[PDB]
Write a protein that binds this ligand. Structure first.
Ligand SMILES: COc1ccc([C@@H]2[C@@H](C(=O)O)c3ccccc3C(=O)N2c2ccc(C(C)(C)C)cc2)cc1
Ligand SMILES: COc1ccc([C@@H]2[C@@H](C(=O)O)c3ccccc3C(=O)N2c2ccc(C(C)(C)C)cc2)cc1
Ligand SMILES: [Ca+2]
Lengths: 170, 163
């Protein structure tokens, strides 16, 4: 049942506060700070929600097709996404950082929290957060959760492709 | 049921990480930075848990900021009878802000009664995690309270004297 508190704190202490000014920050960046000869940053906050709760310290180390470009002024980061070796999209991207509690609990023997318990709580965190965001006034076509289970076959999943599928739905 | 996730995250993402080096940080302060007469900073981390979930933006005239704890934690002096009666590392259990904000958000369907119950369960769950945790070695004290004038300094001093 840890997922409920994780989802509510993440929304009420972070997403609720950053989503209202996000569009204005992206528009300011695109007009005044972005380099001339490249794409504009897309408008939504893209949140990576790996169901395995594996949150890396560097997105480029997780996928070489996701490259840091800049900080979004006014901490959020802009990345370029590659496909077939070329630039395919630019967006504000980050992980659902409360998943780190679920990961750490699965590694702490006193929690009595298995990998199966972790997966169940990650799914509940995603479901609860989606329900909150659906009813939230701050979420106005400006946030997208990217929840994913990684197949056993490495070749059948690309993190950059997962973000690109959502970005192309804009 | 939000209290469980709040307690586990607060422990596993913060208390578990800061409690092992806390007493060394307090010893550094007491030996090299503390210039008060018999004002050694107490050894434990004191965590304010207002059961009403009211966390102010800056931590009572009898509680006065002294310094940042080197190596963000803050040291305060506690006054009693107008004089310094103790010094400690003091801070709020910041996850209570989720419970307060939920009670202020109609779509959460979370009443003041639900809030109080979750604040008490957060305190109990956190105390139990800390009791079984290898990082809490007589170094973290939870100060849970409710208002009846209330004196926050008197609440902290009771726990300081218990150390
Ligand atoms: C003061 O006590 C805390 C406790 C936890 C957090 C963050 C923070 C986040 O960055 O998302 C968060 C917010 C809401 C719910 C859960 C978490 C969470 O899981 N945190 C966290 C938890 C664990 C980690 C390590 C295991 C990598 C160290 C890193 C980050 C921050 C302050
Ligand atoms: C990235 O997403 C987050 C979400 C929440 C937090 C912190 C953070 C804390 O400072 O204790 C925390 C950790 C673990 C569980 C809960 C909370 C929590 O309740 N937070 C919080 C929640 C709400 C507030 C306002 C309502 C005053 C703005 C302020 C702080 C930080 C990052
Ligand atoms: Ca594999």
């Amino acid at each position: 049942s840890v997922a409920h508190g994780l989802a509510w704190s993440y929304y009420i202490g972070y997403l609720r506060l950053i989503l209202p000014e996000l569009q204005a920050r992206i528009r300011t960046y695109n007009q005044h700070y972005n380099n001339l000869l490249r794409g504009a940053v897309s408008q939504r906050l893209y949140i990576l929600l790996p169901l395995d709760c594996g949150v890396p310290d560097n997105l480029s180390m997780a996928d070489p097709n996701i490259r840091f470009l800049d900080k979004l002024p006014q901490s959020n980061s802009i990345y370029e996404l590659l496909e077939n070796g070329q630039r395919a999209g630019t967006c504000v991207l980050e992980y659902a950082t409360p998943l780190q509690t679920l990961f750490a609990m699965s590694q702490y023997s006193q929690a009595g929290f298995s990998r199966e318990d972790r997966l169940e709580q990650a799914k509940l965190f995603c479901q609860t957060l989606e329900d909150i965001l659906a009813d939230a006034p701050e979420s106005q076509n400006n946030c997208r959760l990217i929840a994913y289970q990684e197949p056993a076959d490495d070749s059948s999943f690309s993190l950059s492709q997962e973000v690109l599928r959502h970005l192309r739905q804009e």
